[PDB]
Design a protein around this ligand. Sequence first.
Ligand code: AMG
Ligand code: AMG
Ligand code: AMG
Ligand code: AMG
Lengths: 133, 133, 133, 133, 15, 15, 15, 15
Amino acid sequence: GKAFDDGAFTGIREINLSYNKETAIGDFQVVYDLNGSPYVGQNHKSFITGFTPVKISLDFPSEYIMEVSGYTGNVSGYVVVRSLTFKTNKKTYGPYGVTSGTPFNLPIENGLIVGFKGSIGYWLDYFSMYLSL
Amino acid sequence: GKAFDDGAFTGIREINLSYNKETAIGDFQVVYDLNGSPYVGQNHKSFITGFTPVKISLDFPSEYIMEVSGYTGNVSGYVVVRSLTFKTNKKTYGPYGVTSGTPFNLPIENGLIVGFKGSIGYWLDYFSMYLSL
Amino acid sequence: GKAFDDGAFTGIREINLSYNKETAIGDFQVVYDLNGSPYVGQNHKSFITGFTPVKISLDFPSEYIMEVSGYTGNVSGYVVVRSLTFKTNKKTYGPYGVTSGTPFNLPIENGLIVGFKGSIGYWLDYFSMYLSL
Amino acid sequence: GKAFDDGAFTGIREINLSYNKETAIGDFQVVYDLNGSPYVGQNHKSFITGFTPVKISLDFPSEYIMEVSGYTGNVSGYVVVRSLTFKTNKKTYGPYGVTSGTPFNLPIENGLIVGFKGSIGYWLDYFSMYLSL
Amino acid sequence: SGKSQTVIVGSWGAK
Amino acid sequence: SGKSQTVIVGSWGAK
Amino acid sequence: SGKSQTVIVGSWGAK
Amino acid sequence: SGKSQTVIVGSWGAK
Ligand SMILES: CO[C@H]1O[C@H](CO)[C@H](O)[C@H](O)[C@H]1O
Ligand SMILES: CO[C@H]1O[C@H](CO)[C@H](O)[C@H](O)[C@H]1O
Ligand SMILES: CO[C@H]1O[C@H](CO)[C@H](O)[C@H](O)[C@H]1O
Ligand SMILES: CO[C@H]1O[C@H](CO)[C@H](O)[C@H](O)[C@H]1O
């Protein structure tokens, strides 16, 4: 699918993703903190439709992501990200998507998630995160 | 004067300052690189006029600042920045302002200047820089 | 188990762990790079014995670890780290221990594993890694 | 003179330099913090003698250096570092050497001096500092 | 050089 | 203060 | 926490 | 690669 790279910012304020309960994660778009002021990133859309959107508004300064978990698996010959979940210091934004395949989890003990990059076609093919202090 | 803080970015692409040959540095405004795309910062103007503008366009990826030098001194009871000069890996953007008072220089051996903060009234009262890898 | 924390150094030269094909990883020690000079970390021993030793000598500057994989599982009630495999740019130091339970994997796209921390009772209970540029 | 480079550590515990009130700084050594344990750096000696020693013991975790000042001057033809003064959060370890020539000063607003490097012939020719968060 | 760098982790999904 | 820090990631295994 | 931090150097000029 | 880096600043004195 089409690769994307948001880059590095000051923090995260809101995450907006999409999913399908029988396939995988679809759309992905995050609004970052750029030195105090929000900065909305490019909307990375899927090649198709029929996804259920999710808007994750964090209490910016005080609430930040502590762990990112999910599942990768093959759906129709394409190994993609099927589920994604964000746990913060205040709440857990429950498993979105199908919780099947092989697991992964990135807990941060000291550091902050500061940016996103990855790829999206019909579903989210892959993704990586930028970390900082 | 009025304090300002641009914050941290990915790099610098252009610096736009102003000076008076008999007083000190006046206006200050920089356009940064925010993950590949330029980002123009807020224009920090002086309380007064009659300054000679300077536009410093760097060859972004390839040309970056290696040292920042200048002079601080008192001009009319106000200790301000009287001169400022930026030397890059390709050129020296010669002393702008009055080269009188006490000197300072910040050479970077490994690192990049990534943001600016300081204060401006009639002249640039002070300033600090954000460094990164 | 007993908590340890080696800290952060400049790089990694060698890793000496211990395992058992039916239980999990036991002993754990690592000799780091400290500004171009080897630095032998403390030996974090298991409370019991009967493990098989493995020495992982990297070609220090040239060879560096790019991804750490493993398994977290339940043995004797305790959830511990059952397997561990290190993938460097030159070779893969094959899985040690039991590849059974919940998988975890950290691929590093930009950065270095620069230190370790964790806990060891009879087996490695958990660990964490310091990441640097 | 002879080039040295201690590298980067976790913090600074003590600094042992040497000076002469008519010439400049000579001997230079520093004992660092290495993950909560002292670490005695190598002693970088002057080619000659007749200096006055000074020991600068910081209250390690609590007391940290916030600004380094000094003077670069010309003695016997060679441009060297004539004076040096260390300002920590608790006390100022007064100027050592000759406060004559061109001043230099590095105030740190956010970060730590985490290591030193330079060269020493008869006197300290130059130095550089590693900065970390 | 010229561009800032940060630790980037992963690439979870398609190889 | 006085002690440098670095991004430490994880905690894999027991809690 | 929540906001990223970087080494900032100086404050050259008025004390 | 293999060796970590940090922002080193300056070079004050002789060139
Ligand atoms: C059905 O293919 C489309 O979507 C898949 C999964 O999302 C891949 O991205 C592929 O490159 C793209 O052409
Ligand atoms: C003449 O005063 C004005 O300019 C000076 C120097 O620039 C100071 O900023 C001061 O705070 C401001 O009110
Ligand atoms: C069998 O007991 C010991 O090991 C387990 C698993 O390693 C835990 O560490 C526990 O604290 C320790 O007392
Ligand atoms: C007097 O000579 C010596 O000291 C000076 C000043 O320190 C220079 O280091 C020079 O290289 C060294 O040979």
